[PDB]
Design a protein around this ligand. Structure first.
Ligand SMILES: CC/C=C\C[C@@H]1C(=O)CC[C@@H]1CC(=O)N[C@H](C(=O)O)[C@@H](C)CC
Lengths: 18, 568, 144
C-alpha cells in the first residue's frame, strides 16, 4: 500500500489552510 | 618567431568556454589542457556530496569561485528520508576554509548545516562571500544566521528557502538592516520566522538600492506597505500573508506594489484580494498560486488577464477549465507546474480535477512549453500523443496520476508514452508515476527505447513483470539517475538492470520483491559502487540507494542505514 | 593620422580614432614615441593589416544587425591565422577583438569530443591510462 507522498512544502501549507 | 600553435593561446581561449560539458571534454585532450582547465574552472556542482572527498575537489579545482553541493536524495523532499541520513556540510567548509580561498558563492542543497560550521564559513570567507544559499537544509539556528550577516558584510544574495532551523531571535535580520547595502536577493520563502520585524525588512529595502527579489514568510502584507514603497527596483516578491477579516471589506485595496514587479505570488490570496493584481496583470511573467486560496473559477479570471505569463505554478484546483483559459491567453508559457491540492474533502471543488481534456487543450495552446509537471486525475493515450505532437521543445516532463479515481478511461498507456517520447526529442528529464495497470512491459521497453536524451527518470508503477525492467535496461543510452518507487521488480532484476545501463550513476528505489538473504542485490557489486539500505522519516518499506563514489563508503551513516558489503 | 611600423619594417597610415582602439597604442600617446611612429615589432605585417581592417569597420559604428554579419564573415580564416590574431589583439589591447578571436577558437571546441578535439588541432594525447581514467571518473561521477 504505497501512498502518494506529499511534497513537504505543500503538506505544511495544506494544514495551515484548515 | 616560430609558427604559432594552439598551445600558445589556450590559457586565454579556455576562459571563453563556459559550458560544463565542454570543460569536461577540454580537460581530457591532454595533460596541459587538463591543468589549464583545473586552474581556471570557476563553478562546480556535485549532485551528491558523498561522491568524492573534499580533498579531491580542492585538488582538482583550487580556484573555484562558486560551489554547489547536494546531499539527501530527492525523496527527502517528500518526508521519505530519515532526518539523520547524512549530508553534513562541515568537512566541506573546513575544506573551503583551507583550500578554496577564492570562493565567493556557496549553495548547499538538502544538506545538514550546523551553527558551528556556518560560523566557521562566515569567518573563513567573510567579506568575500557574495552569495550563500541554504537550500532546503536543516540543523542550524539564528545564531548561525547572525554569524554570517555580521562577518560577511558584503552579501549580495542570501537564501534559506524551505530550510528548517531553530529560531531563537531576530537579530540576524536587524543586523542586516543596520549595516547591509549590497543585498540583491533575499529569500526565506518557506520558513517559520516569528521573531523578525517587518520594520527591519523595510529598512533593508530602503538601504539596498539593487534589491531585486525578496521572498518571505507569513508576514501580514499590510505590515509591508512601508517595505513596498521603499523597494523601488523590486522585480520579484513571493510570500507574505493575506488575512481577510470581515470588518474590512476593502482591507487591501490601497496597495502600492513596486512598479517593476513582474514575478510574484501572494500567500493565502483569496478571490476578494485577488483584484489588487489587475492594475498591472499585463506585466506579470511569473505566477505562484501554489499557496493561494482561490478556486477554479477565480483562476480562470486571473489567468485570462496575464497574456505575457511564461511561468505558472499552481495546485490542481486550476482545473481543466483553468487549463483551457491558459491555453489561448498565455501563448508564451514556458513552464507549468500543477502540484496536488487537498485530496481529502472532495477535490477543492468539482472542477478541481485535471484530465485528458485539459492536457490536450494545453498541448494545443502553449506550444512553447519547456517544463511541464502535472498531477492529473485521469489520462488517455490520446492526450500523450498530442503532447508529443505539439510541444517539441519540452525538456522536462513529469506526470503523476492520483489514486482518487477508481476507473481510468483507457489504461495501458504503452502507445501514448511512445508517441510522446518520439515527438519530444529534446527531453532530458522525465517522470511517469502511474497505478498498477498503467504500463505493460511492452510499454516500459518503449520508454527505454525512445528516450535517447533523458538523463533523469522517476518511474511510478510501471511494468507488469521483471521482463519489462530488463527490456527497459537495454535502452536509456544517457540515463544517469534513476528513481523508481512502487514497482513489482525483484532484487536480482534490479541488480541486473543496473549492470545493463551504460550511463547510470545513481539509483534510488522504494518497494521491490526482497529476500531475507539480501544477497541478490549483490550481483551488482562493481568497484566504486556504493549500495545503501534505508527505513523512513520526515509503514515505510526498504529503500535502496546506490551511487558511484571515488571516496569509498561513508563514515557518517546513521543506525537506520545499512551498507551492503559482499558476504556478511 | 598615425604611423604604425610593423614587424618587418612597414609603415601603416591609419586614422586617429582607428589606432586608439588599441589601449596599447593609446597608453603610448602619453610618453608619445609617436615622433618616429609607433614601433610594434611583434606583429606580422600581414596580420597588422587584418587588425586595422577590423578596427576600421568597428569605429564606423558612429552611424548592430549587419555587424555580427561582417564579423562572422571576417572570421572565415584558417586556424594558424586565427591564432596569430588573438596573440595580436592581446599584444595591442583590443578588448572587442579578443572577445572575437578567442571566442572563434572556443567555438571550434564547443561540441567536439576529446578525440575530435586533438584531431582538429593535432595534439598528442599524453595521458597515462590511469590518469585519463581518474579524470574521466571525476568528470562523470563527481564534478558537474
Ligand atoms: C521515491 C520518492 C520521490 C518521489 C515520489 C513522490 C510520490 O509519491 C509521487 C511523486 C512524488 C515525487 C516527485 O518528485 N514527483 C514529481 C515532482 O515533484 O516534480 C511530480 C510532482 C511531477 C508531476
Amino acid at each position: 500500500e504505497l501512498p502518494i507522498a506529499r511534497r513537504a512544502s505543500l503538506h505544511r501549507f495544506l494544514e495551515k489552510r484548515k | 618567431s616560430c609558427v604559432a600553435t594552439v598551445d600558445d593561446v589556450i590559457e586565454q581561449v579556455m576562459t571563453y568556454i563556459t559550458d560544463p560539458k565542454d570543460r569536461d571534454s577540454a580537460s581530457l585532450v591532454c595533460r596541459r589542457w587538463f591543468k589549464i582547465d583545473s586552474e581556471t574552472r570557476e563553478h562546480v556542482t556535485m549532485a551528491l556530496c558523498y561522491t568524492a572527498t573534499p580533498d579531491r575537489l580542492s585538488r582538482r579545482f583550487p580556484n573555484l569561485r562558486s560551489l554547489k553541493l547536494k546531499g539527501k536524495p530527492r525523496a527527502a523532499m517528500f518526508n521519505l528520508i530519515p532526518e539523520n541520513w547524512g549530508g553534513y556540510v562541515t568537512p566541506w567548509v573546513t575544506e573551503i576554509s583551507n583550500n578554496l580561498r577564492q570562493l565567493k558563492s556557496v549553495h548547499f542543497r538538502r544538506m545538514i548545516v550546523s551553527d558551528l560550521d556556518l560560523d566557521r564559513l562566515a569567518k573563513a570567507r567573510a567579506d568575500d562571500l557574495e552569495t550563500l544559499k541554504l537550500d532546503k537544509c536543516s540543523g542550524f539556528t539564528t545564531d548561525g544566521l547572525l554569524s554570517i550577516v555580521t562577518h560577511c558584510r558584503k552579501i549580495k544574495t542570501l537564501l534559506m528557502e524551505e530550510s528548517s532551523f531553530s529560531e531563537k531571535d531576530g537579530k540576524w535580520l536587524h543586523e542586516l538592516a543596520q549595516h547591509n547595502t549590497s543585498l540583491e536577493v533575499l529569500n526565506f520563502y518557506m520558513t517559520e520566522f516569528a521573531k523578525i520585524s517587518p520594520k527591519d525588512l523595510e529598512t533593508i529595502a530602503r538601504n539596498c538600492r539593487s534589491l531585486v527579489s525578496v521572498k518571505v514568510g507569513d508576514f501580514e502584507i499590510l505590515e509591508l506597505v512601508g517595505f513596498f514603497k521603499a523597494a523601488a527596483n523590486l522585480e520579484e516578491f513571493c510570500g507574505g500573508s493575506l488575512n481577510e477579516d470581515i470588518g474590512m471589506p476593502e482591507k487591501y485595496m490601497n496597495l502600492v506594489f513596486p512598479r517593476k514587479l513582474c514575478r510574484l505570488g501572494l500567500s493565502y490570496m483569496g478571490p476578494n484580494e485577488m483584484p489588487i493584481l489587475f492594475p498591472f496583470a499585463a506585466q506579470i511573467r511569473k505566477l505562484d498560486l501554489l499557496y493561494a486560496l482561490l478556486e477554479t473559477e477565480d483562476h480562470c479570471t486571473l489567468i485570462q488577464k496575464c497574456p505575457n505569463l511564461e511561468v505558472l505554478e499552481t495546485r490542481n484546483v486550476i482545473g481543466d477549465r483553468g487549463l483551457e483559459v491558459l491555453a489561448q491567453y498565455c501563448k508564451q508559457l514556458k513552464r507549468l507546474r500543477i502540484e496536488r491540492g487537498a485530496d481529502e474533502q472532495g477535490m477543492e471543488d468539482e472542477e478541481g480535477l485535471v484530465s485528458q481534456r485539459g492536457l490536450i487543450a494545453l498541448a494545443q495552446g502553449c506550444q512553447e512549453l519547456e517544463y511541464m509537471a502535472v498531477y492529473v486525475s485521469d489520462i488517455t493515450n490520446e492526450s500523450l500523443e498530442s503532447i508529443g505532437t505539439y510541444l517539441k521543445n519540452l525538456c522536462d516532463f513529469r506526470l503523476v496520476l492520483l489514486d482518487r479515481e477508481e476507473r481510468i478511461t483507457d489504461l495501458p498507456l504503452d502507445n501514448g508514452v511512445r508517441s510522446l517520447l518520439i515527438g519530444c526529442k529534446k527531453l532530458r528529464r522525465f517522470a511517469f508515476y502511474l497505478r498498477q495497470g498503467g504500463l505493460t512491459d511492452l510499454g516500459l521497453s518503449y520508454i527505454g527505447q525512445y528516450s535517447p536524451n533523458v538523463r533523469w527518470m522517476l518511474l511510478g508503477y510501471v511494468g507488469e513483470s521483471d521482463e519489462g525492467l530488463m527490456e527497459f535496461s537495454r535502452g536509456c543510452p544517457n540515463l544517469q539517475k534513476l528513481e523508481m518507487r512502487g514497482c513489482c521488480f525483484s532484487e536480482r532484476a534490479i541488480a541486473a538492470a543496473v549492470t545493463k545501463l551504460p550511463s547510470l550513476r545513481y539509483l534510488w528505489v522504494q518497494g521491490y520483491r526482497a529476500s531475507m538473504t539480501g544477497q541478490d542485490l549483490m550481483q551488482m557489486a562493481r568497484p566504486y559502487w556504493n549500495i545503501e539500505l534505508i527505513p523512513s522519516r520526515r509503514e515505510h518499506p526498504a529503500h535502496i540507494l546506490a551511487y558511484y563514489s571515488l571516496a569509498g563508503q561513508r563514515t557518517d551513516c546513521p543506525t537506520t542505514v545499512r551498507v551492503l558489503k559482499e558476504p556478511i | 593620422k598615425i604611423v604604425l611600423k610593423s614587424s618587418d619594417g612597414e609603415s601603416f597610415e591609419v586614422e586617429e580614432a582607428v589606432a586608439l582602439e588599441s589601449q596599447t597604442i593609446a597608453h603610448m600617446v602619453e610618453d608619445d614615441c609617436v615622433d618616429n611612429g609607433v614601433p610594434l615589432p611583434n606583429v606580422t605585417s600581414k596580420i597588422l593589416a587584418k587588425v586595422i581592417e577590423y578596427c576600421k569597420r568597428h569605429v564606423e559604428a558612429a552611424a548592430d544587425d549587419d555587424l555580427k554579419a561582417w564579423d562572422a564573415d571576417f572570421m572565415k580564416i584558417d586556424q594558424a591565422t586565427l591564432f596569430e590574431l588573438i596573440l595580436a589583439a592581446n599584444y595591442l589591447n583590443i578588448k572587442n577583438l579578443l572577445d572575437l578571436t578567442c571566442q572563434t577558437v572556443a567555438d571550434m571546441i564547443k561540441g567536439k569530443t576529446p578525440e575530435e578535439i586533438r584531431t582538429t588541432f593535432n595534439i598528442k594525447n599524453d595521458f597515462t591510462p590511469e590518469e585519463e581514467e581518474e579524470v574521466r571518473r571525476e568528470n562523470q561521477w563527481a564534478f558537474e
